[PDB]
Structure formats: C-alpha cells, structure tokens
C-alpha cells in the first residue's frame, strides 16, 4: 500500500554546493578518504539565530493539596553528567542504603507470569 | 533575492545606532520623554490651553492625537501629560504613578488622515477620513467612555470632495472659514460659522 502511494509523486534532485561571491572570505570543510579517494572541500554555511528560554520540566496544575502514599522502592536510578560522579560514585551507594537497597528490576532473577507460579504452587507439595 | 538580506542588515544596523544614541543622550537634551501607544497615530496638535497646579513642580497639557489601527474600531483621542514646570525639581521627577494618561476617546469610522482644532474654538476640531468628506466634532458633547456599539454622531460632516485628502486649515481671522484639499485636484471651502440646520 505504502509503496503505491509513494509511486504517485515527483521530487526534485538536489544540487551540490555552489559558493556565492557574497563571502569571498569564510571557512571551509574537508573530508579525508580512508580509502583511495581524494578529499573535497566546501565552504561552510552559517545559520540565522533563534532565542532560547530557561529550563523547565513536566508538571500538572492544581488548586488544592493532594495526598500521596509513601514510596519504598527506588524503581529507577538517576544519571548525572557522568563526570561528576566519576569523582563521587559513592553517592549512588549512599542513596541505595537510604532506600535500603531496593530498586524495581533488581533481584528479578528471571520472570514470572503467575500462571507458572500457580502451577508450581499446586506442584510444590509438602515434601 | 538580495533586498531581503540587505534589509535584515539595515535593521540590525539601525538597532545598533539607536543603542548608541540612547547611551549618549544625557549630555544632549534637557528633557527625554518616551511613551508607547498601542496603535500608532498620524496626527499631532498641542492644545493651546495650559493649566499649572500649584504646590508642585510640573505643568499639565493636552494633546490631540489620531489613530490608524489595523482593522479594529478607530478612535479619536486626546490625552494628558505632566511636563515638569520647575528648574530645581528632579520617583523620577514628580509623582511615582504616572505622567501620561488618556482622557478622551470617541468612536471613529475609518482611520484618521488629519486633525486640527479650530483656532476660535478649541472645542471645535476637523477630521480627514479615508472617505471623500470631512468630519467635525466637539468632544465636550460626547463621553470619554466610547460607544461600545460603534459609529456615532458625526457632528455635522461636510461634502464636496470625491477622493480623500490631507489639507486642513481654518481661517484664523474668520470663523467657519476652512479650506480642504484632496486627490480631486480641488480645494473645497465650507463656512460653518453659522449652520443652524446642521
């Protein structure tokens, strides 16, 4: 089906770089060939600018407080810039002790769909 | 094309130049007052009357402004300004709340192409419109709160032109005598010094 709909189109071919005289002086790039080929050189192209905005995260609005039961297992592990904890990798273990070493996915020891569990329970007679 | 690139450049340059002029102003003027309106104007007229409240450092003046909005309701406006009337006074110079305030709004059909107050009566002003006629108004006969409906009393509009224009001049000595000039290649003259049956 998709190939069909694709067969109903017409699309331009691209043209390779053609430097404009508007910048007689600029920088250029080149790509070495790891195999038996020469290297091409092309002037770079500069983009316009856009303005950025400060950070923020997800959150949903509210107008009254909201009860929340407690959380006992970590269920996920954070990720720093991989260079900060390169010096303080222990903070992870500290947190682990705080939650007393409990994160979802850990100690999985395989998987169970609770049907084989019921089968084993019916099978694991008192021996 | 080219003109687009070029205009982008020119814009950035103008921005820089204004930055500089602003940085340099303090050694240049004896007063700097800037204020932004929502819609621009095409008119300018200082009302010939002035009041100066005592116990203060500032005068008070009234200005005659027009309006050429994009699409929405047009208006004739006259607002207020608190010019410092003092040499030793200088939040900023006087009160802290505000130095400019709108006071007069009147519904208007079409933009304003011209507006001048009558020399004999400042309460009488004229008006050039996108149409082919002239409008006159006396603000004292309309509330500042504008008619939320829209168009209102034209207050004795005129007749005799076929395309719009911009010329406008009362006769200083003679009341009612007022000249006009429009794309019609003509000069039209009414005399409203006495029109009982408006």
């Amino acid at each position: 089906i998709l190939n069909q709909e694709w067969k109903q189109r017409r699309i331009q071919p691209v043209h390779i770089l053609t430097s404009v005289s508007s910048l007689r002086g600029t920088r250029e790039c080149s790509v070495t060939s790891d195999l038996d080929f020469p290297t091409q050189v092309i002037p770079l192209k500069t983009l316009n600018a856009v303005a950025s905005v400060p950070i923020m995260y997800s959150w949903s609005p509210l107008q009254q407080n909201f009860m929340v039961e407690d959380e006992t297992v970590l269920h996920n592990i954070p990720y720093m810039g991989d260079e900060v904890l390169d010096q303080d990798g222990t903070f992870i273990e500290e947190l682990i002790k705080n939650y007393d070493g409990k994160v979802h996915g850990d100690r999985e020891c395989g998987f169970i769909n609770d049907e084989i569990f019921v089968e084993l329970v019916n099978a694991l007679g008192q021996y | 094309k080219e003109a687009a690139f070029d205009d982008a450049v020119e814009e950035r340059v103008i921005n820089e130049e204004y930055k500089i002029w602003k940085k340099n102003t303090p050694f240049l003027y004896d007063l700097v007052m800037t204020h932004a309106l929502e819609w621009p104007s095409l008119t300018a007229q200082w009302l010939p009357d002035v009041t100066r409240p005592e116990g203060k450092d500032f005068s008070i003046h009234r200005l005659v402004l027009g309006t050429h909005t994009s699409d929405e309701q047009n208006h004739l406006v006259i607002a207020s300004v608190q010019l410092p009337n003092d040499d030793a006074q200088f939040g900023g110079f006087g009160s802290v709340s505000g130095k400019i305030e709108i006071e007069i709004k009147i519904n208007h059909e079409g933009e304003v192409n011209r507006a001048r107050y009558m020399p004999q009566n400042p309460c009488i002003i004229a008006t050039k419109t996108p149409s082919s006629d002239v409008l006159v108004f006396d603000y004292t006969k309309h509330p500042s709160k504008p008619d939320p409906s829209g168009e209102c009393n034209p207050d004795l509009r005129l007749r005799g032109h076929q395309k719009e224009g911009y010329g406008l001049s009362w006769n200083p000595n003679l009341s009612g005598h007022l000249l006009s000039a429009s794309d019609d290649h003509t000069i039209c003259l009414w005399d409203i010094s006495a029109v009982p049956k408006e």
Partner: protein, 42 residues
C-alpha cells in the same frame, strides 16, 4: 554489585607595540591584507 553499578552513556574511557594598525591588521586576515606592514603585528 551488578544491580549497583551506574549505567554509562559513553565508552569506558606581538613584541612590537607598534600602533593602532593592529586593528587594520585584524579585520583583514586573508585576501590581500593591505599596507604590507601588518604582518609584523602578527
């Protein structure tokens, strides 16, 4: 230990105080930088 190791993204891992002309030296630095004397102010 296996359930305690943090995951990793990447792998394991001038002398001559000549003049103002230094300005005119700076803005053209290719394609016929004129005055032929700015090279000393490299």
């Amino acid at each position: 230990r296996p359930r305690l190791q943090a995951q990793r993204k990447f792998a394991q891992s001038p002398p001559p105080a000549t003049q103002i002309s230094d300005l005119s030296k700076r803005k053209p630095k290719t394609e016929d930088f004129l005055t032929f004397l700015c090279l000393r102010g490299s």
